[PDB]
Design a protein around this ligand. Structure first.
Ligand SMILES: *[C@H](CS(=O)(=O)c1ccccc1)[C@H](Cc1ccccc1)NC(=O)[C@H](Cc1ccccc1)NC(=O)OCc1ccccc1
Length: 215
């Protein structure tokens, strides 16, 4: 494998977004994965709709949590594989209240056929990401409010609570690390990203990694 991969620095990741005061992390995670995979499948890099998931994905709980695997399944099984653009279905849940689902006025920007869940194995997760692009992952982000920059080694790792986007890794550094896109604006962390140590299941990053599949 390449000693270091960074799909953001290659230009395959959209800008860091703002989930606001809403428990929508799962939506931003999943949509960010679909954005990258869509571009990597031979389509333009598009901003896609978290709000579609927040308002209409009734297998999840909108501003009160969800699973990226649930959201991928809902897209295929309930929304005919379609993902709307961010512009046609814009985020409106930044204050904690999601508007009702609307079934008109929205425009497709990407389609997916399914999803792959990845082995609970950091090494195999790295090997997958190096070839197939960024990965949606769940983490223990309880220590992350106090994150300021640098390779976080003190990820208190007791419970999954957050959904984020694994965009790369760097094995050549003194302490190898993952590179994670967050959804808390660029004023948090390293212009919206965070680095956690790689190889000791920091933040329980191995436990629920997955990715959409563009047929
Ligand atoms: C988003 C995380 S966050 O709000 O940005 C955040 C992160 C770190 C610290 C502080 C805040 C939400 C937060 C939330 C909101 C309501 C209830 C619980 C959690 N996190 C989730 O949605 C979690 C993330 C997760 C965890 C494990 C595996 C995948 C993703 N998801 C979750 O709690 O799912 C519960 C669920 C709801 C409905 C259907 C199935 C499962």
């Amino acid at each position: 494998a390449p000693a270091a991969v960074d799909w953001r620095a290659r230009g395959a990741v959209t800008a860091v977004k703002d989930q606001g005061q809403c428990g929508s992390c799962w939506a931003f995670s999943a949509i960010g994965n679909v954005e990258c995979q869509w571009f990597l499948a031979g389509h333009p890099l598009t901003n896609l709709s978290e709000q579609m998931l927040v308002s209409c994905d009734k297998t999840d709980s909108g501003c009160s949590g969800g699973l990226m695997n649930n959201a991928f399944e809902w897209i295929v099984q309930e929304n005919n594989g379609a993902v709307y653009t961010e512009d046609s279905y814009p985020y409106a849940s930044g204050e904690g209240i999601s508007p009702p689902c609307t079934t008109s006025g929205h425009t497709v920007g990407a389609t997916i056929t399914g999803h792959v869940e990845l082995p609970q194995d950091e090494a195999q997760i790295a090997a997958w990401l190096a070839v197939n692009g960024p990965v949606a992952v769940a983490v223990d982000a309880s220590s992350w409010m106090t994150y300021t920059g640098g390779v976080m080694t003190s990820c208190v790792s007791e419970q999954l609570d957050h959904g984020v986007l694994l965009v790369g890794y760097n094995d050549s550094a003194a302490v190898p690390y993952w590179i994670i896109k967050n959804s808390w604006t660029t004023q948090w962390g390293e212009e919206g990203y965070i680095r956690i140590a790689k190889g000791s299941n920091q933040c329980l990053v191995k436990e629920e990694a997955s990715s959409a599949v563009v047929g």
